[PDB]
Amino acid sequence: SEKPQQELEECQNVCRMKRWSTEMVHRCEKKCEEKFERQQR
**CATH number reported for the structural domain that contains residue 3 in this entry:** 6.10.250.1700
CA distances from 23 to 10, 13, 15, 28 (A): 19, 15, 11, 9
Rounded Cα gap, residues 25 and 17, in angstroms = 8
Domain of 13, in residue numbers: 1-41
Structural domain count, the chain: 1
Cα-to-chain-centroid distance, residue 10? 8
Q: What is the dihedral of CA 6, 11, 13, 18, to 10 degrees?
A: 170
For Cα atoms 34, 15, 18, give the angle at the middle one, nearest 5 degrees: 155
Q: What determination technique applies here?
A: NMR
Rounded Cα gap, residues 4 and 16, in angstroms = 20
